[PDB]
Design an enzyme around this catalytic site. Structure first.
Site, PDB file in Angstrom:
ATOM      1  N   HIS A  98       0.815  -1.241   0.000  1.00  0.00           N
ATOM      2  CA  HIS A  98       0.000   0.000   0.000  1.00  0.00           C
ATOM      3  C   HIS A  98       0.835   1.271   0.000  1.00  0.00           C
ATOM      4  O   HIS A  98       0.268   2.358  -0.072  1.00  0.00           O
ATOM      5  CB  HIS A  98      -0.943   0.023   1.194  1.00  0.00           C
ATOM      6  CG  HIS A  98      -1.731  -1.239   1.364  1.00  0.00           C
ATOM      7  ND1 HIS A  98      -1.272  -2.298   2.108  1.00  0.00           N
ATOM      8  CD2 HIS A  98      -2.935  -1.611   0.876  1.00  0.00           C
ATOM      9  CE1 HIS A  98      -2.158  -3.279   2.067  1.00  0.00           C
ATOM     10  NE2 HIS A  98      -3.191  -2.874   1.351  1.00  0.00           N
ATOM     11  N   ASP A 130      38.284 -27.043  14.910  1.00  0.00           N
ATOM     12  CA  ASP A 130      38.521 -28.347  14.305  1.00  0.00           C
ATOM     13  C   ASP A 130      39.795 -28.336  13.456  1.00  0.00           C
ATOM     14  O   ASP A 130      39.750 -28.463  12.257  1.00  0.00           O
ATOM     15  CB  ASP A 130      37.290 -28.780  13.511  1.00  0.00           C
ATOM     16  CG  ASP A 130      37.269 -30.253  13.189  1.00  0.00           C
ATOM     17  OD1 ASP A 130      38.332 -30.899  13.237  1.00  0.00           O
ATOM     18  OD2 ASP A 130      36.189 -30.772  12.792  1.00  0.00           O
ATOM     19  N   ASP A 156      33.543 -30.262   2.792  1.00  0.00           N
ATOM     20  CA  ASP A 156      32.963 -30.289   4.141  1.00  0.00           C
ATOM     21  C   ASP A 156      31.431 -30.433   4.190  1.00  0.00           C
ATOM     22  O   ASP A 156      30.870 -30.627   5.243  1.00  0.00           O
ATOM     23  CB  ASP A 156      33.396 -29.056   4.945  1.00  0.00           C
ATOM     24  CG  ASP A 156      34.789 -29.227   5.651  1.00  0.00           C
ATOM     25  OD1 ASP A 156      35.168 -30.358   6.005  1.00  0.00           O
ATOM     26  OD2 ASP A 156      35.478 -28.230   5.904  1.00  0.00           O
ATOM     27  N   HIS A 188      40.721 -32.606   4.120  1.00  0.00           N
ATOM     28  CA  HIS A 188      41.310 -31.764   3.033  1.00  0.00           C
ATOM     29  C   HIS A 188      42.683 -32.188   2.576  1.00  0.00           C
ATOM     30  O   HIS A 188      43.385 -31.427   1.883  1.00  0.00           O
ATOM     31  CB  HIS A 188      41.378 -30.279   3.441  1.00  0.00           C
ATOM     32  CG  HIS A 188      40.072 -29.718   3.918  1.00  0.00           C
ATOM     33  ND1 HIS A 188      38.966 -29.590   3.102  1.00  0.00           N
ATOM     34  CD2 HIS A 188      39.703 -29.231   5.127  1.00  0.00           C
ATOM     35  CE1 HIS A 188      37.966 -29.099   3.818  1.00  0.00           C
ATOM     36  NE2 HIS A 188      38.396 -28.834   5.032  1.00  0.00           N
ATOM     37  N   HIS A 195      40.257 -32.151  11.670  1.00  0.00           N
ATOM     38  CA  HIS A 195      39.708 -32.633  10.384  1.00  0.00           C
ATOM     39  C   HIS A 195      40.497 -32.228   9.178  1.00  0.00           C
ATOM     40  O   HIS A 195      40.342 -32.821   8.079  1.00  0.00           O
ATOM     41  CB  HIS A 195      38.271 -32.189  10.181  1.00  0.00           C
ATOM     42  CG  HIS A 195      38.108 -30.866   9.500  1.00  0.00           C
ATOM     43  ND1 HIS A 195      38.397 -29.673  10.130  1.00  0.00           N
ATOM     44  CD2 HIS A 195      37.583 -30.539   8.287  1.00  0.00           C
ATOM     45  CE1 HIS A 195      38.051 -28.670   9.334  1.00  0.00           C
ATOM     46  NE2 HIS A 195      37.559 -29.168   8.211  1.00  0.00           N
TER      47      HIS A 195
HETATM   48  S1  FES Z   1       1.733  -0.613   3.259  1.00  0.00           S
HETATM   49 FE1  FES Z   1       0.190  -2.154   3.627  1.00  0.00          FE
HETATM   50  S2  FES Z   1       1.384  -3.952   4.162  1.00  0.00           S
HETATM   51 FE2  FES Z   1       2.891  -2.341   4.003  1.00  0.00          FE
HETATM   52 FE   LIG Z   2      37.124 -28.170   6.483  1.00  0.00          FE
END
Ligand code: FES
Ligand SMILES: [Fe+3]
Ligand code: FES
Ligand code: FES
Ligand SMILES: [Fe+3]
Ligand SMILES: [Fe+3]
Lengths: 170, 446, 449, 170, 170, 449
Positions: free
Chosen positions: F98, F199, F355, F207, F202
């Site tokens: 609106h 970690d 990962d 890796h 790992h």
């Molecule tokens: S202006 Fe109506 S929902 Fe934002």
């Molecule tokens: Fe990793």
């Protein structure tokens, strides 16, 4: 294996487009008669997930497969989608195929080895939608009316099938 | 009331409600023996498979010592899934995140940098992946999470009278052929469990087209026409721990088109079954069975499909489909049975493909509040059943009937109501009081 | 609170919360009269449609005997959906799991193998598919699950004064054209319900480009600028059972580009409407309405789209869109009204396509805890409304205002608050106390002219 | 029922690729001017789910349709996207089309009947994704050395649309 | 602005189909050698959602990108799938590509500007499925009887990537 | 028990359970200071970004006086998300439904038809978009929903000793480069948080491939070889409010292949860092950090990736990935750092892509009831840690260790068990009693040298 010429490529793609139209319009009898050889082996293996270190061989036709059919077995399968009267298929479920990446190779004796990618979109009832992707490996014979398939291998991309069934042809 | 054993009806909530499901997980799946596979799937030492016990991932391994052990497929460090392969051979399993190493029984056997970084202070004996109890019946492998459960032998109980006919038979018994088909189906696990335990009724209606096509023996079922004396053609059975099946006489190979070896095998072995198990069980040996083992394993004997319905909540399952074959059948006969079983009942099954909506619709219709506060009827044949002078358990007069539904839901209720196995065992002598016609067979057979 | 009727605000929980939704299913959808369709959708004996009451699937059937009946689309054996067709003609419906056969009223009429396998020992009387009470108003068909509910006519109540203008009109009333469009939208059912009941305000802002493109009468609204004396231009209405609408004067066909037949029909029939219903209702007959019937049916009279917002939990709906047309219009007019209505408000609508995010964002923003513990405002025009000497219910001064929001949420609150229909009926005479400006219209009209 | 030459098929495929690129880049005015005939009927019927036994005829252009437009009506639809300020489309949502299974046939008088599968992938805002499949049935005429569509029928695969709208062209 | 001849079009499609095959079969080294030029820039920009009124320029190679690589950096990426036991890729995940709407234009100096739409379907483990759509903008040059790409720009359709990673080539 | 601080284990429920997650929302995400970005992302007056605080959408805006404000991205009318742009410059934000207009601080400053249709009777000052407290540290911007929360400085607390090394450093500190990568990952937000906080273990397993290919410093980690004195090579740190990191000595640029500018920048600035902050912190300045700031921000200092793990329920996150760079580096150096950081740790990262399954599997494995009623171990290095005479908080002897896990889960438990900040503050003097080895470093350092 030498790649086919562009004119042969064309004819192979045209053949696959007509095959898809038959599927999509339910003309399965015409497909069997006109597009499939009587010596067909139609094969969809079950591939399991294995460690890369696993040296076991790939599935053969003697092992578990979702489809493992000769011409008579395909005729049998096709009739379900006629006549039904199969209540899940009243009215027929919808299917649409997207075939891509068609590559053909001359294989001697007039035969062709053909690879393709297939995407299958299915709809039924109100909101049911399922999608499948597969590789297809065909051997095609030339005959008096174009091509017929005499070996078809379908490689499913999903281990666990996310659909009620795989009751469609490719 | 979720199950009315007096009037043979169930609440639609049993296919739908989340809290009912949670109670099932507690009082059925965490308590019962569940199908894991068969020795034939893990035939050599070191062979394993990954599988489910309800929603828990498990590893089943053929130990170097020849025993079969299972464990929860979750690392004792940060929880990661230990092994992702469907099958293989392994002397050890290694978690991919930090490299903790698990033995064939799930023991924590080594950790990287155990000396350098853990200073040998890690108590590896307390860090095994959780063991699951494993027991075997004729090569079939089951698991159980409850140390108070009865033996597998006692859980099958009088159902063993029946299973011995086919899982021992002429002497070779049966085995499973993998790898399994796996698919998701959006239904409650009980819809397929009840369909296979007892649903002769649906066959002539849902599968009328398939039967007309196949021709031969079972073709007569197509359309469920009124003129056939179905009761002159089979029986239905239920037992104390919920297991049951129906049988169609002389129809074992009825859905197979290429059946020379399977038909010949039965011909060649039936005489030995008669000798070992009596004519009453030779009858079964040649019949087509639709069977469920409580809770969530089913098979067709004759057509030879074998299914586990793994729950994924109340509105989904993952279905695993194997082939069941006699061990003593020739390799070519095993392969043909597998092709016919998969063509009729696999993921692209000429029969199975017909059933998907039956199962999902029975579930998902209950999205509606007015609908799910309705009930389901399983009264077919009530009073036309009771104890039999030969066959143990409770026997109904036709494979088209709901005797085995009633037994299934009776035991489902017993389990859901019992706080422990001791309470269930307390009812062992009186379980079948809900089948009131105690003289039915004596009076009928006379 | 969920709804503040004093200060006209609502909790954001009403678009989001699962327990609120569950109370709606029990106290509104399981209680109210819900739109099933229209005789025109099931016009001949045996004709049926499948539809929804909230999340329950139902079958509506034109009985051999000419009456209408409805029942839950779920078999009494193992629960399977009985019929999957959108529409058809049937004397019976067969469950395709095992073949149980159900009559046009949901009676269980045949069971395969009843003798052989049931031994005629099935009580089919206790196994009918569950009935749904059906009543009709001017051809429009409604269903209700509560036997204590008032008649449909009493449920529409004083709103019949308005509906009779157009659902009787010059004599022929209106009817629905299908098949319906159907689509999922990830919003709470109330967002479109309130949007259609009373949201003149968004039109000039959201639909500015569609309005300015069409030009004509409604094109003045585009942009929402001060230039225009809006209150001179229309009214808003709300009633005791939450039904409400806004009207823009002399704008019925303002969004139709090809509108020769429709405009001619209005001109040709307005005279008889003046005679039957008076000048005050002739005014409405020529106006553009945006209306909702409590809880979840909406329509635009003039543009002629007609919508049912079927809930799928609190954060999704399935929207069914039909066209509403006068029965007495020529077929060519009826087809043209249908084209214009679908081009504007169908699934690819040139206006409707603008609104989908307005609906979903209002709902899914509440994923955040801090966000949903806020509130929503519907105070526009508060106190410029009250009981009116001619028009029943409560009337506010402009299509741009929130009289109908306030009426909607007031009733929503009443129903959600009420343990049974008796407790709702127990406040029939004091429902409108929350509109305190009793002499608003006396003073406005006296002082005027 | 005469399938087109490979050279004609190529031209039609090229036309459809250029059409897709106009859609993907929002050049709707170029599309309408260059690729659509002023005698166009643009039609997307509503197909209900019916039992096979049902003998009612298929939808015609006198029945409910999501689109049922002549040229002037397409021009109106175009201008909402091309010129309007529509807040949902600030900035434009993304769309990508995958057109497959193009099969063309010479009809009378230089006209072509052309069949096509279409997969439409739509993205907007941060995580919104929607996907549509449909069949297309076109009548094209040459507009040397391109083509213009004069009838387009679009057949939706899904009964219940799982999207906010169907406000995109095919 | 000159579109390619049909014969050159065919050759570009055949090149792209071979490329896809190399991706799907894990032949990355062969791809790098035979299909990618040594002066390659392989670039996947991060596009933010901006209001239409924003006048800021589009991403350049000096801005954040998911890929922004020269040949050596591509070589490095390719080996991760070789020179490493990568446990997530034991066994390798599955990938399938659907390439459509290939449009090529002669760009000067014998170079080709090539547009295409890409749909990428990926599966791994038991039930994991992810899907991506992209626009691809290449500059190719002729290399022997084929082509090599020397500029590749990949335009993701999704702002928030709904996958664990984007570790695949296009 | 969800967290056992005596024996250093946790329930797997912490990765899974929806009620635990609700408590985290209440007692962590709605209580703590959360990372929003950095001034560099909103550098001029009017610049803004959209981001998250857990599941709430927020707008962060650079005001005209050079301060920063933030507010919930939801309209006070019907709730619609106010702004959809990732970034831009705006003196106001307009809601698309609106057209209500919100200022740079979320104040409702204008509404269409305020006179005409609202009769100037809308109380706009009560309808601001909900404010979020915003504080900055060395250019980094945090938000907090809890009026009772201590200052951002006190929340960072003793961790500032560490952060000043790099977020002040030789005087220019650090900044963020966007835009961010954004991806969904199906894991609990704690799995990455803990992975980054501590970690080291790992790295050489997961890796190994990436490492072997890069070569140089960190390549020796590959395969986690038992012959390497890891404790000679780094340290691990944890602090009173959960923040921690591990450091690998002399390895800041170790994962960068093209690193001339970054390596020279460090060489040119370490002198001044040694001057201000001591050789004890120059050590850190030249090292590679893996760091988490409690709860859900992580970074690698050296590799220069910077991550925020936004929860989407207990089983999903949306990961935002920026580049962190020194402000005083040359533009060419900043660009090169960003390319290397992204090539290793972006959505297509050569390391990061390894990962994903580690994160998701540790979460989803708990779908099973027997599995999720198990526990997780974080005991590595227990008793080889304690208060240090130079470094504040609690220090462990290796970057391969779980000191930082233990600190993280200790603080998580403390927050989850505490009904408010007052209860947390009451633990300030005894928070580290769960690290019993009080003389560990005094004996160690004395026996050394
Ligand atoms: S202006 Fe109506 S929902 Fe934002
Ligand atoms: Fe990793
Ligand atoms: S999670 Fe298994 S080794 Fe760390
Ligand atoms: S479920 Fe309907 S007939 Fe059995
Ligand atoms: Fe069946
Ligand atoms: Fe609108």
């Amino acid at each position: 294996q030498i790649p086919v010429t562009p004119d042969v490529h064309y004819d192979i793609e045209a053949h696959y487009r007509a095959e898809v139209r038959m599927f999509q319009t339910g003309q399965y009898r015409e497909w069997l008669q006109g597009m499939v050889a009587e010596d067909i082996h139609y094969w969809m293996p079950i591939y399991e997930q294995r460690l890369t270190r696993d040296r076991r061989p790939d599935p053969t036709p003697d092992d578990a497969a979702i489809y493992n059919d000769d011409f008579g077995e395909l005729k049998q399968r096709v009739e379900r989608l006629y006549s039904g009267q199969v209540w899940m298929e009243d009215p027929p479920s919808k299917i649409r195929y997207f075939v891509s990446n068609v590559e053909a190779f001359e294989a001697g004796n007039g035969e062709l080895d053909v690879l393709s990618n297939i995407l299958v979109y299915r709809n039924r009832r109100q909101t049911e939608v399922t999608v499948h992707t597969l590789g297809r490996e065909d051997k095609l014979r030339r005959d008096g009316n174009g091509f017929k398939v005499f070996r078809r291998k379908l490689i499913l991309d999903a281990r666990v099938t996310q659909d009620k069934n795989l009751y469609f042809f490719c | 009331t979720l199950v009315d054993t007096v009037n043979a009806s169930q609440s639609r909530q049993v296919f739908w409600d989340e809290d009912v499901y949670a109670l099932e997980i507690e009082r059925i799946f965490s308590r019962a023996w569940l199908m894991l596979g068969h020795e034939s799937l893990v035939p050599k030492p070191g062979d394993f498979i990954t599988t489910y016990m309800a929603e828990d991932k498990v590893i089943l391994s053929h130990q170097s010592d020849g025993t079969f052990r299972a464990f929860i497929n979750s690392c004792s460090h940060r929880g990661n899934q230990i092994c992702h392969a469907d099958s293989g051979n392994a002397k050890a399993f290694v978690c991919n995140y930090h490299g903790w190493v698990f033995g064939q029984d799930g023991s924590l056997v080594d950790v990287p940098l155990e000396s350098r970084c853990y200073h040998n202070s890690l108590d590896k004996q307390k860090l095994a992946a959780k063991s699951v109890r494993v027991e075997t019946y004729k090569g079939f492998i089951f698991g159980c999470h409850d140390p108070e459960a009865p033996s597998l032998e006692d859980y099958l109980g009088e159902f063993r009278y029946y299973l011995d006919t086919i899982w021992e038979g002429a002497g070779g018994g049966m085995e499973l052929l993998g790898p399994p088909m796996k698919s998701l189906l959006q239904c409650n696990w009980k819809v397929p469990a009840e369909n296979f335990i007892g649903d002769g009724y649906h066959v002539g209606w849902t599968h009328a087209a398939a039967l007309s096509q196949i021709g031969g023996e079972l073709a007569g079922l197509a359309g469920n026409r009124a003129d056939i004396p179905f009761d002159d053609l089979g029986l239905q059975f239920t037992t104390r721990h919920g297991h049951g099946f129906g049988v169609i006489d002389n129809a074992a190979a009825g859905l197979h088109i290429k059946r020379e070896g399977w038909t010949k095998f039965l011909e060649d072995t039936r005489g030995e079954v008669r000798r070992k198990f009596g004519p009453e069980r030779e009858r079964l040996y040649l019949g087509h069975w639709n069977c469920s083992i409580f809770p969530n394993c089913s098979f067709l004997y004759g057509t030879n499909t074998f299914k586990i319905w793994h729950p994924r909540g109340p509105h989904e399952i993952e279905v695993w489909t194997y082939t069941i074959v006699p061990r003593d059948a020739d390799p070519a006969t095993k392969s043909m049975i597998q092709r016919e079983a998969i063509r009729t009942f696999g993921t692209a099954g000429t029969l199975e493909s017909d059933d998907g909506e039956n199962m999902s619709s029975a579930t998902y219709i209950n999205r509606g509040v007015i609908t799910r506060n309705g009930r389901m009827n399983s009264t077919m044949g009530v009073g036309y059943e009771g104890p039999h002078p030969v066959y143990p358990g409770i026997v109904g007069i036709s494979f088209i009937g709901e005797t085995s539904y009633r037994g299934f839901y009776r035991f489902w209720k017993e389990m859901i109501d019992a706080p422990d196995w001791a309470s269930v065992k307390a009812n062992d002598d009186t379980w079948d009081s809900v089948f009131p016609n105690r003289n039915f067979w004596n009076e009928k057979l006379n």
